[PDB]
Design a protein around this motif. Structure first.
Motif, PDB file in Angstrom:
ATOM      1  N   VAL B  49       0.660  -1.204  -0.042  1.00  0.00           N
ATOM      2  CA  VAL B  49       0.062   0.055   0.153  1.00  0.00           C
ATOM      3  C   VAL B  49       0.808   1.146  -0.039  1.00  0.00           C
ATOM      4  O   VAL B  49       1.720   1.288   0.720  1.00  0.00           O
ATOM      5  N   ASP B  50       0.509   2.153  -0.779  1.00  0.00           N
ATOM      6  CA  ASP B  50       1.053   3.390  -0.718  1.00  0.00           C
ATOM      7  C   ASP B  50       0.196   4.620  -1.366  1.00  0.00           C
ATOM      8  O   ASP B  50      -0.738   4.386  -1.829  1.00  0.00           O
ATOM      9  N   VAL B  51       0.788   5.849  -1.471  1.00  0.00           N
ATOM     10  CA  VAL B  51      -0.161   6.840  -1.817  1.00  0.00           C
ATOM     11  C   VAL B  51       0.339   7.271  -3.355  1.00  0.00           C
ATOM     12  O   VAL B  51      -0.321   8.215  -4.082  1.00  0.00           O
ATOM     13  N   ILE B  52       1.526   6.883  -3.641  1.00  0.00           N
ATOM     14  CA  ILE B  52       2.216   7.255  -4.971  1.00  0.00           C
ATOM     15  C   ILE B  52       1.967   6.279  -5.991  1.00  0.00           C
ATOM     16  O   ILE B  52       2.463   5.083  -5.737  1.00  0.00           O
ATOM     17  N   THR B  93       5.708   0.960   7.361  1.00  0.00           N
ATOM     18  CA  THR B  93       7.110   1.686   7.130  1.00  0.00           C
ATOM     19  C   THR B  93       6.898   3.086   6.590  1.00  0.00           C
ATOM     20  O   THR B  93       8.051   3.686   6.346  1.00  0.00           O
ATOM     21  N   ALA B  94       5.652   3.591   6.247  1.00  0.00           N
ATOM     22  CA  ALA B  94       5.215   4.709   5.894  1.00  0.00           C
ATOM     23  C   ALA B  94       5.737   6.043   6.631  1.00  0.00           C
ATOM     24  O   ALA B  94       5.913   5.829   7.866  1.00  0.00           O
ATOM     25  N   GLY B  95       6.039   6.996   5.873  1.00  0.00           N
ATOM     26  CA  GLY B  95       6.222   8.483   6.758  1.00  0.00           C
ATOM     27  C   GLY B  95       7.544   8.992   6.507  1.00  0.00           C
ATOM     28  O   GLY B  95       8.107   8.581   5.515  1.00  0.00           O
ATOM     29  N   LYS B 116      -2.685   8.903  11.758  1.00  0.00           N
ATOM     30  CA  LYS B 116      -4.170   9.051  12.098  1.00  0.00           C
ATOM     31  C   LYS B 116      -4.917   8.716  11.034  1.00  0.00           C
ATOM     32  O   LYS B 116      -6.209   8.367  10.998  1.00  0.00           O
ATOM     33  N   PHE B 117      -4.372   8.614   9.666  1.00  0.00           N
ATOM     34  CA  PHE B 117      -5.182   8.108   8.394  1.00  0.00           C
ATOM     35  C   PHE B 117      -4.661   6.684   8.285  1.00  0.00           C
ATOM     36  O   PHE B 117      -5.867   5.983   7.952  1.00  0.00           O
ATOM     37  N   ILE B 118      -3.555   6.092   8.410  1.00  0.00           N
ATOM     38  CA  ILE B 118      -3.137   4.892   8.082  1.00  0.00           C
ATOM     39  C   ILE B 118      -3.939   3.595   9.130  1.00  0.00           C
ATOM     40  O   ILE B 118      -4.522   2.937   8.449  1.00  0.00           O
TER      41      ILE B 118
HETATM   42  C1  LIG Z   1      -1.389   9.448   4.448  1.00  0.00           C
HETATM   43  C2  LIG Z   1      -0.441   8.625   4.070  1.00  0.00           C
HETATM   44  N1  LIG Z   1      -0.476   7.138   3.850  1.00  0.00           N
HETATM   45  C3  LIG Z   1       0.620   6.688   3.416  1.00  0.00           C
HETATM   46  C4  LIG Z   1       1.074   5.503   2.915  1.00  0.00           C
HETATM   47  C5  LIG Z   1       2.184   5.233   2.373  1.00  0.00           C
HETATM   48  C6  LIG Z   1       3.656   6.170   2.229  1.00  0.00           C
HETATM   49  N2  LIG Z   1       4.607   6.008   1.821  1.00  0.00           N
HETATM   50  C7  LIG Z   1       5.930   6.442   2.341  1.00  0.00           C
HETATM   51  O1  LIG Z   1       5.855   7.377   3.370  1.00  0.00           O
HETATM   52  C8  LIG Z   1       7.176   5.605   1.935  1.00  0.00           C
HETATM   53  C9  LIG Z   1       8.339   6.475   1.699  1.00  0.00           C
HETATM   54  N3  LIG Z   1       8.863   6.733   3.221  1.00  0.00           N
HETATM   55  C10 LIG Z   1       9.602   5.712   3.910  1.00  0.00           C
HETATM   56  N4  LIG Z   1       9.881   6.231   5.124  1.00  0.00           N
HETATM   57  O2  LIG Z   1       9.888   4.852   3.400  1.00  0.00           O
HETATM   58  C11 LIG Z   1       3.187   7.553   2.614  1.00  0.00           C
HETATM   59  C12 LIG Z   1       1.922   7.791   3.052  1.00  0.00           C
HETATM   60  S1  LIG Z   1       1.203   9.359   3.583  1.00  0.00           S
END
Ligand SMILES: Cc1nc2ccc(NC(=O)CCNC(N)=O)cc2s1
Ligand SMILES: Cc1nc2ccc(NC(=O)CCNC(N)=O)cc2s1
Ligand SMILES: Cc1nc2ccc(NC(=O)CCNC(N)=O)cc2s1
Ligand SMILES: Cc1nc2ccc(NC(=O)CCNC(N)=O)cc2s1
Ligand SMILES: COc1ccc(CC(C(=O)O)C(=O)O)cc1OC
Ligand SMILES: COc1ccc(CC(C(=O)O)C(=O)O)cc1OC
Lengths: 330, 330, 330, 330
Positions: B49-52, B93-95, B116-118
């Motif tokens: 899962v990711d936002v990009i 691992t996000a953030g 707070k979203f995840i």
């Molecule tokens: C509301 C949000 N949901 C997400 C889900 C994934 C990510 N992805 C990362 O942050 C990957 C890159 N960062 C590291 N630390 O590897 C950011 C967000 S912001």
């Protein structure tokens, strides 16, 4: 000292690695090869070589910090090739990579110039090594490494179509609902635009899919199986467009070849080798054909029975690669 | 259809995966966790899962292409958390990631906002999963994940000092000429600057190093073993300075914790858990102590007999974390 | 207690295994299945069942003493089927075994009577399991276990020709100097004297050996490849004559099947399933055909395109099994 | 010929394996070592030697038949030691084994006589091999193999107390509800009745169990931890009584030592080696102490800080072994 208080040394002996692997290039591909090789327990020593000192040391340290979870007791790095001494396998992943809309064949001059430095330095310290070429255009660069090194052909291998064939089998697997391990199919020739899907050999449990659908792989095919080969051809460009480069699949494909070599498996893989004397090819062309891969590299080549159309496509791939080989300036 | 000509379907069953793992975040850390889990055959389904969206699709496709070389038959991805349904383990691992010359503590508010979203989205789709927090500052973020999720404390685990201890054992192993598997030593508290090396438990074959060097790890130590813990503290900063980030060692540390959870091993790991009630700590502070890790997450804590020096350092680590934590609004 | 001084319990122990495997029968086959499964890390719990009290306890204890070298945290045993509760896979290896010069078909009366006790007891405690029949005659006993169990046919699998095909591939590999992994060949029908070598599907890299040598597998073959199938048929008899029984190869063949089931791989294996409706067979005969094997057992059957002789041989194998099966009372 | 129609050979290889292992003796112990080594992918060639022609061939064939499921491409056997040529590691499991209630020391002359034939034949074909003694009494037979071979002491290793310590850790793990990998404890001295449990080094996460219970392992201990060592001593006798012999745990223990040697891990194991110069021993006594084990065998010994009672017990184990050792006829 605490070490002498805790441990009595009983043997002096100079340590010589028995299953050493070197990875040249610490870009995304080189590091994916390194992590895959480490997690497959193929080596007793791993050496990394690059020209970017900080990045090199950083990558080495990051792998070293995972040692407790691994079974490779020595991980080393240097810009100096003396670090690669006594390798059984040297994996070359250095060089320029293609941009979107750029052919791998366009990398030739840039990558040959780099190989002119790397190849003599690699072979100098490892008399027992096999050379495994990953850098693109892989078929041309396997020929280049073979010419520069002066090694016998069995010892110079290109990662070639091992990945194209893995992609083909993954895609065939998805269409059929079968694991890729039980889906058989060969993509031969150039690891690039002119690759050849060998439809005549595509099968599940020995059942030829072409024998069930005679039009399989042609424009008359109702299911358009040719689109599977197009997806194979376009895969690197699709992944590059999405994430900027490719790494995981090639790393696993290279580790798969490193396993056959290191463990003397004598498994068959579609990898870059010299094909002179096969399918009417009279020149020193390197391209992927099914090869028996073991401790001495490629000891044997499988003679695939191709249909006249498949053979014409393979010859077309060879003529393309030969044309680029004629552009080489040693 | 060719599939129907080749295969007789006897059971049309989509069927829920039984050993599903989700990795949230496809940055270098998330992908190193993903590849390490895949190479350890811990899951029958991996979700990303990711936002990009493009980055996410390319990473999933790159893993899918190596399917022939793996034993994880389903790799999926989406920005939509519905893709994470029925996960046994969800790894966050996000953030914002640690920056050059900056503490992990500098990422706190931004990562709390992202959590707070995840966290509610993860909980919605896998209400019975174990959450494994990797994002920094890991100790605070595990507490945050615990409060947002509403899960019992056993199911909210921080990767904590599992890596700091692996780094410590690697460095101790290099000094002694012994594999880190045979060099025992624990780094507890914050996964950061205030971590605590437990010199009193450092040993090889049950032989306490402190019994051979009473000043071990102190200022008065003639061999300056405190420099080994200094190297552990500094490791991520050095690796970030050299290669831009850390990924490989953390990916392996995370796969090590995923293995104990997925295989119900009940091995002891120094991981982040609620320490309220131990060593005079009266607040809802999370930090690393040796925990028994299995199918239900953290079921038990090993009560380490710390020397007054080690207990003072652990209290100080708890104070540093609580200081940041108390000024948190969510 | 020392345990409570050392460990603080934070969670009540309501332990239920997630990937439990049971092996019924602790003779040489059962134990080879057990060791192979343990070494492949397929289970979080291994249960053993037999009627010989001492032997069963000794075998369980001997596996337990190797726990440090394994990743299966709980090994249990009992004559009582309560020990098998919540298994995902139950492997049946119990029953009489053939003497020198005795057919597997001669064990049917003894083994059907044993199955009348074993099968209901297994299903009583593991309602979610897949049944993996190894006991002989495997094809008839798979049908027997299916009728007794009340399980759907997909969940009752016979080890069948997975071993005969592995033997065929090993022998083919030895003749060609290729690893068996790259030597494809299927032995179908009865796991016994009436097995069918599918010469038409025998290949290396998609190259049909029968297209190269049309006489392949016939008496007119100069290389006498039919002797390969003869060695396959005679294997168990030859090994029994030499060492008294067989164990290692069947153990590995069963672990291979357990892996496809436990990891939901959907790999294709030649295993015992109902063939009524294929090749003009009208009775509830079970025999080996290539099956897709996963978490719900046999989900699909591959329709192999056999030559007229291969098809007649397969129908003859079915007739042989039916001649024994039609006279059964249970 | 078919092989020639299918394959073009490039070169005639040296065919000398790089990671060859020999197992001498195809009894229950020898075969458990063989299967465990095969499933850990430690060798590229496995050779078996025995004096019973039929049993030897039967065992080799049964392993060969599982090749498809392995990654050891050559499995051979012969009564002639020429089959063992160029082995990196030679494992001796041959000779008389303990009957019910029989002491391992009772096997001494029968096994010394057998070793008189075996050892020179092993040395002749692999003069650079490491010798790993499993046959009993292991400590005395490691001394015997050392004297007969003429090898330096680092290359002659006895399996010793590696299994006794694994049993101790399993039992400690069962008592604490912790995986044996996280339970630390060392059993030293003779692999038999006179073994020594090092209570001072028994710990979980560096927490000494003796620091929590000062009477640990004594008659005054409320929980009777000495019974864990009594269970260790009695284990083989209890298992022999139940199943007639032991095989699985010793096979796993031997493969664990084989792994440290073949992969040059430098892990610490309690194995048989010369202890002259330690604990007041002035004679060529072989017994278990913690050893660093790698590619050159035993390179170093850990000096365990024994209590006066523990040291007296170890010197008692030494005296017991030397009593028999000093009067051997060979
Ligand atoms: C509301 C949000 N949901 C997400 C889900 C994934 C990510 N992805 C990362 O942050 C990957 C890159 N960062 C590291 N630390 O590897 C950011 C967000 S912001
Ligand atoms: C004379 C030279 N020796 C080397 C050695 C390594 C590298 N490293 C890379 O090119 C890594 C980045 N490239 C990809 N494709 O990952 C470049 C050079 S230039
Ligand atoms: C009613 C019964 N339940 C059982 C359960 C196990 C066994 N055990 C074996 O038969 C193992 C030995 N046999 C082979 N073929 O390995 C026999 C019986 S009889
Ligand atoms: C001169 C001799 N060379 C050998 C070689 C192997 C064996 N084989 C066994 O002893 C296997 C059975 N015994 C145990 N302990 O498993 C006996 C002899 S006698
Ligand atoms: C040395 O660089 C590479 C070599 C091969 C691949 C594999 C790639 C390709 O051939 O472009 C592919 O097919 O995925 C990628 C590389 O850099 C990212
Ligand atoms: C339950 O007993 C057995 C089941 C299968 C085999 C496999 C064997 C055979 O079918 O006889 C073989 O083919 O090796 C052997 C058994 O006992 C020795």
């Amino acid at each position: 000292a605490l070490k002498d208080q805790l441990i009595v040394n009983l043997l002096k002996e100079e340590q010589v690695p028995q299953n050493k692997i070197t990875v040249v290039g610490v870009g995304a591909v080189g590091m994916a090869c390194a992590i895959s090789i480490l997690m497959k327990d193929l080596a007793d020593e791993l050496a990394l070589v690059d020209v970017i000192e900080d990045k090199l040391k950083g990558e080495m340290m990051d792998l070293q910090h995972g040692s407790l979870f691994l079974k490779t007791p020595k991980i080393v790095s240097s810009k100096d090739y003396s670090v690669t001494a006594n390798s059984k396998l040297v994996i070359i992943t250095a060089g320029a990579r293609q941009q979107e809309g750029e052919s791998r064949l366009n990398l030739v001059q840039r990558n040959v110039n780099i190989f002119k430095f790397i190849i003599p330095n690699v072979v100098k310290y490892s008399p027992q090594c096999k050379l495994l070429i990953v850098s693109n255009p892989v078929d041309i660069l396997t020929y280049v490494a073979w010419k520069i090194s002066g090694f016998p052909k069995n010892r110079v291998i290109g990662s070639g179509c091992n990945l194209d064939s893995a992609r083909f089998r993954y895609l065939m697997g998805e269409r059929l609902g079968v694991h890729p391990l039980s889906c058989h199919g060969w993509v031969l020739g150039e690891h690039g635009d002119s690759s050849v899907p060998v439809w005549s050999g595509v099968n599940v449990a020995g059942v030829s899919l072409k024998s069930l659908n005679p039009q399989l792989g042609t424009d008359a095919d109702k299911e358009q199986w040719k689109d599977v080969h197009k997806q194979v051809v376009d895969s690197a460009y699709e992944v590059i467009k999405l994430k900027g480069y490719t790494s995981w699949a090639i790393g696993l494909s290279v580790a798969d070849l490193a396993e056959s070599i290191m463990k003397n498996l004598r498994r068959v893989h579609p990898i870059s080798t010299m094909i002179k004397g096969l399918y009417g090819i009279k020149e020193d062309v390197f391209l992927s054909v099914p090869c028996i891969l073991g401790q001495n590299g490629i000891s044997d080549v499988v003679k695939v029975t191709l249909t006249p159309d498949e053979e014409a496509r393979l010859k077309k791939s060879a003529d393309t690669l030969w044309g680029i080989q004629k552009e080489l300036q040693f």
